[PDB]
Symmetry: C3
Subunit: 442 residues, 3 copies
């Protein structure tokens, strides 16, 4: 209508329970048809808002967004742990108050994306030419990939993090986009945004997805703030490639992504003031000439998976990789806390000492004022999920455990390492690196 407000439950000849995709595409076509003029009275393509009330909507056709200033919003992120529910024995399902996620819920009933993943996306944002598509907003709704499927391993289907489905895929260059207050669940990829400028991914709940946030191709001046993020052992929690000026702060990143923050070729960016929890090494990775980044005042925790269905599932990386791994130049690693809480039996390779910060290549890295705390605890598992997670998080009964605080590989040199471990805990060629050991008691 003329005021550009739409409700998917109030669309003529549209049934959002059967196919919300069709309904939203139909609304998009109506907006285009009504907003054909670009320069009438200094305006004419102001866009529109499409509202989703709380409800269970099945999406069977991909939504194509190719207009600037489109807001899609609901009234609930609607998360519940489908992982937990699928691992509760089936005979107990009748006793459960509810089984599925809710809120303003888009169920992605698309076939898988193979041979690229874009075709498995609920929402695809694509438009080439000039200007770059701008200020699209997604807010406060839920995107549910429903089931994970078998992939060839022995594992249960619902625990593979594989289904070919994506929540939102932005394929073209974009400016001033927003994703806020969303729920994403049970999607192989929650949110993939290519070629992003001044994007804000703020205050979402992105969990039980193979991969959560992926910033691809390149980008600039973006920020990932205030999110709650949990990915899968073969995927990324927060990933970026070729970004400049990215700010990653105030996220609570919990397991079980392969990593917490993964950068390839990321420069002049900040990963600061996050809480990072992982069950595997390689929590924060600065790869392929990631340079001039600040990694500051983050809380790193690495311990063992305490929940039986994923005990013995891992990211294929050994404890020599590091919690923080750097390949590149002129980074600053300041004021971080590292808690390494592992069973001395569970260490790989056999009889190795864990590495916390590892510099594999590059020059001029500044590492200063980082506190490393290490503890030996035996790795219990039980079937009761949140009970086991909270019991393991709060457990402080331990021997001490030896760790390498900072390892500088010979392929990295001219680094500066200050108060980030005792002389023992810093493994580095002193002739080509400035080292100041943390003073010990004596």
């Amino acid at each position: 209508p003329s005021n550009n407000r739409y409700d998917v439950t109030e669309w003529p000849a549209g049934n959002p329970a059967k196919d919300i995709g069709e309904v939203i595409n139909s609304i998009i076509a109506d907006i285009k048809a009504r907003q054909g003029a670009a320069d009438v009275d200094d305006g004419g393509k102001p866009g529109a808002v499409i509202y989703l009330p709380p409800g269970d909507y099945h999406l069977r056709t991909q939504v194509l967004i190719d207009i600037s200033f489109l807001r899609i919003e609901g009234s609930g992120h609607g998360f519940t742990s489908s992982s937990i529910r699928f691992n509760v024995p089936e005979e107990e399902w009748p006793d459960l108050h509810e089984l599925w996620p809710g809120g303003s819920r888009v169920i992605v009933d698309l076939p898988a994306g193979g041979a690229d993943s874009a075709a498995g996306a609920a929402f695809l944002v694509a438009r080439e030419g000039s200007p770059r598509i701008s200020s699209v907003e997604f807010s406060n709704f839920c995107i549910d990939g429903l089931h994970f499927t078998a992939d060839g391993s022995g594992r249960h289907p619902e625990n593979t993090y594989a289904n070919g489905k994506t929540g939102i895929h932005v394929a073209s260059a974009n400016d001033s986009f927003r994703v806020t207050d969303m729920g994403f669940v049970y999607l192989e990829n929650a949110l993939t945004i290519h070629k992003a400028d001044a994007l804000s991914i703020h205050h979402n709940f992105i969990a039980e997805c193979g991969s959560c946030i992926e910033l691809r191709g390149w980008g600039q001046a973006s920020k990932i703030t205030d999110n709650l993020v949990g990915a899968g052992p073969r995927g990324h929690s927060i990933y970026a490639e070729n970004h400049g000026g990215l700010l990653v702060t105030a996220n609570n990143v919990f397991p079980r992504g392969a990593s917490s923050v993964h950068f390839k070729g990321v420069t002049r960016s900040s990963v600061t003031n996050n809480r990072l929890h992982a069950f595997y090494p390689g929590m924060v990775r600065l790869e392929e000439n990631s340079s001039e980044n600040l990694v500051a005042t983050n809380h790193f925790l690495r311990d063992h998976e305490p929940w039986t269905p994923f005990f013995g599932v891992d990211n294929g990386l050994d404890d020599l990789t590091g919690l923080l791994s750097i390949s590149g130049n002129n980074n600053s690693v300041i004021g971080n806390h590292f808690s390494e809480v592992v069973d001395a039996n569970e260490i790989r390779p056999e009889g190795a000492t864990p590495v916390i910060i590892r510099l594999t290549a590059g020059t001029g890295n500044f590492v200063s004022t980082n506190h490393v705390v290490a503890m030996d605890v035996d790795a219990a598992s039980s079937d009761s999920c949140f009970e086991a997670q909270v019991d393991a998080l709060l457990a402080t009964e331990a021997a001490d455990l030896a760790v390498t605080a900072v390892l500088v590989d010979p392929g990295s040199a001219r680094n500066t390492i200050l108060d980030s471990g005792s002389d023992t805990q810093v493994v580095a060629d002193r002739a080509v690196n400035a080292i100041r050991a943390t003073p010990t008691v004596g």
Copy 2:
């Protein structure tokens, strides 16, 4: 039917008389319409209940016992009832307004009795069995407890921070809850959440409540971000117990709580990048084996109350307590700024050297690169509230004051203390602690 309600558009009850009866009725209708858990891959998506701006009296506790329920308004509606009530009653006809506004829930309940304080809660979220109640959302409305009452403290009744009333009380284990954009005023307890997993308390205005945010029992992976917080002298600003992986960041905490942030049993969490202003000692307390927490890049200011009605009111603690007090192991205290701005005469006990960081118990704590700044100022009093608060904040005309930057009690040992004060400013056994004094001039 599309799961969207408006309290001013419901047949039963009257939102102005009893908004609680109206909301409970809506919840009954949601339960009556959403009776099945597995029809076409959903069936309990929840709902949204809207509070237009208005003055709504609540006489019946609202019981929330469904997942995916959102309650939202169009206004946080704060004004300082505290100021208003300390303006002579004679002048109240002269004021543009007297009460809070916005989407306002006026809590007219009787006091939280001899059974429990949960019965004083405007909103009680509780459900037992499985799964945990999930993704309930509270957004952009006001909860006003209207008056404080005499509690046997002899201060004017409106200044007691006592009425047995709670804003939102969550009694059961919960997952993915959200409290955003809210206003809480004149409640003995604004927000008390038991047993929270992955909670977010984001961008709220929680002021002039006896206690503001309390995370009780236990929890994991939650976050308290971007909030404006002001509590009362016997209560908590931000409190948490047996939490693992909590992130408290980007909050502006102003007086006059007993504390700014108070932890009991909290592990592997982060209190980073907050602004903290207190009128008393014990601003940040890590108690009862609170271990492996990062306390980083916060700004602490502790000065004297300038407002006459609370001039002589305090938290009962003496200047030897600390601005930051730690009882626990392996914590990291890094990059914090401490401004101590007191009258030297009023220092308690008399002639004491005020303590700033105090390590009362535990081992392995890392205290590095903290800037202490201490000042002696004449403590003024005034009835013109915000005038006197701003003046006090801006006044630096002052003499330099001797303080103990870090005090390690004999019961704490093997701590590391770098660049957080001179040798005189650090009181500690050097034989069992590693101390490097901030380098001196020259």
Copy 3:
């Protein structure tokens, strides 16, 4: 009425022609209906005014003089008018769109007078007497000043950053105000707030405005969080005067303000965890006795404008000014990263050594653990804006550059400077300051 208004459903006037007349008409209707302040514990709860997506010319200033008024939209609606206005005019018909959109207020007010810029403000919040106007809210709409105009500078009219228009001007003392999710574009001033208490400016997109955020007169306990900010070269990005307890964090500030953050007489405030990018020196300025401030874990990038229309334009300041410049007492500068990426041939004065941190006046400042990285690069020009910006942000093809990491002027003394540069990099009197050089290997 339930205090909910829609500007496209109002009987008088035309929001496409004059949204200001419509909104003022709604405001008068609120005041007429809410005449009493103490009827049933309430009476003036305020209201919400909703702007659907659309193009709305404003010709009459809106005057807001009631508490608890919320003005909300469904789109921040940013597009780069700057890019578009530097596309040849004859090509404009073939662009997908030209203008900003979303919920768009176009400010068609004639330029603000010499005496006061409040008269060029689209929204003016102003009311004297007691109490202070409280809890006004601006959310998720777009304010567009449309054109920049010729100002004598000889630059193209659309690149001058001058038109005497303001988005939102608050003249009067205020409490608990909130400005969230907005889009501001093409205004000489985006947001000016006098005398702010407990203000939150959160998650806004404030770009291509002469000045973006200015907190004037005085203020306290306020915060500026999670904003994307780009100003003009004669203006401020974030500015504050006579504030105490200001928290500035998690903002991604891009060019091209005269500065990123500028304080005058600001005390006991925190400028922490921001990503700051400038094309000019003088990025962060603490002036006129800015004391007891924390400036921590920011990422500073300074480089050369790469977009042709502004390639020769600067803020008037030379490379001896410093990226961070301090005039005041007892500040803390901890854990920041500075990238200085400039052409040796374009340094001014000729063959000067660029300064990174400058202490011009005051005593007791603590500077610790700052990583300075400096590079000789030739950022060339391109006519294609977002292309030039990404290329320059990711280029490290770069020989090394000598810089002064910390300069202490003789008018400042008794500072402490640790691990913030080598002995060559610290230009300061060793007799009167405490200096620990960053260890080097040599």
